[PDB]
Design a protein around this ligand. Structure first.
Ligand SMILES: CNC(=O)CN1CN(c2ccccc2)C2(CCN(C(=O)c3ccc4n[nH]cc4c3)CC2)C1=O
Length: 291
């Protein structure tokens, strides 16, 4: 059943896609639709395909609706509703008022105990939620392929949801490696076997989670392998394959204790089956955040 499109009131533009836009909207007379807090503007985000969108654009949109429709977890973007029985095609999701996690964290510093900041335990809670979302995706045998902080959204009280913006945002253009006629590739987040053979699996999602964890512990203030060129990062993948002890790893963030760094290192294991499963990554971080 279609969400009543006429109840969607535009408020501002959140994003410019290639063929679509994402808008911030209010829902008029909110509680009439509940299958919202009293006296407050119920905001949602709406992804809308332009009425003059191509056949290809419309096809990709319809497939995204199918994919989103099954994702049902507290730390994954949720499909609240659709408007697809007529044009323009719409998808609706929760408004995450603090934007993408990379921008959010970039605007924070680790609290100095000696005295906006964020605590170490809170950093772990951020990471644990990401791991919980990926744990869910793993149980569906759903491979994300582009896990990074730029692809996570942040709501109130540091709640996190995993999304998938695509690779076209100007702000993150430097995170993607482009060759004519090939797939655009987030090489700095990619397991060696992804770079060399195009093989994306849950185990390469684990590797990307390691890099994402490294980002969180760096407070998003440096790009992974930031002093190496795209070419050297690709060459590094070659060194993982060759396995002659010449491969290199991201270094330990200042905010990251050695035990936690050793867990990161395990995510970057050459052998896929030796990378920790998400159920264990979550358990580790939630124990450490709790205690
Ligand atoms: C798991 N796959 C996905 O999430 C794919 N999809 C689905 N999708 C979506 C967008 C609206 C309605 C329904 C679905 C997005 C969400 C993130 N995007 C935004 O532009 C954005 C930006 C700031 C926001 N603040 N609050 C919410 C925000 C949304 C890109 C499109 C996405 O990644």
């Amino acid at each position: 059943v279609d969400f009543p499109r006429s109840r969607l009131r535009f408020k501002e533009k959140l994003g410019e896609g290639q063929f679509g836009e994402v808008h911030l909207c209010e829902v008029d007379s909110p509680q009439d639709l509940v299958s919202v807090r009293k006296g407050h503007p119920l905001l949602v985000a709406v992804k809308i395909l332009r009425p003059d969108a191509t056949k290809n654009a419309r096809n990709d949109f319809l497939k995204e609706v199918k994919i989103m429709s099954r994702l049902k977890d507290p730390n994954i973007i949720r499909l609240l509703g659709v408007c697809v029985q007529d044009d323009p095609l719409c998808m609706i999701t929760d408004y995450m008022e603090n934007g993408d996690l990379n921008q959010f964290l970039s605007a924070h510093q680790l609290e100095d105990k000696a005295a906006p900041t964020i605590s170490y335990p809170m950093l772990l809670h951020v990471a644990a939620q990401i791991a919980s979302g990926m744990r869910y995706l793993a149980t569906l045998n759903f491979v994300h392929r582009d896990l990074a902080t730029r692809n996570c959204l942040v709501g109130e009280n540091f709640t996190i949801k995993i999304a998938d913006f695509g690779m076209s945002r100007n702000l993150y253009a430097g995170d993607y490696y482009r060759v004519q006629g090939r797939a655009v590739l987030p090489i700095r987040w990619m397991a060696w076997e992804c770079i060399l053979m195009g093989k994306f699996t849950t185990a390469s999602d684990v590797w990307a989670f390691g890099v994402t964890l490294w980002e969180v512990l760096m407070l998003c203030r440096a790009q992974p392998f930031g002093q190496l060129t795209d070419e050297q990062v690709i060459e590094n993948a070659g060194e993982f394959f060759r396995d002659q002890g010449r491969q290199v790893y991201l270094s330990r963030p200042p905010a990251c204790p050695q035990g936690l760094y050793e867990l990161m290192l395990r995510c970057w294991s050459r052998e896929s089956e030796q990378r920790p499963p998400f159920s264990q990554l979550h358990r580790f971080l939630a124990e450490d955040a709790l205690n």
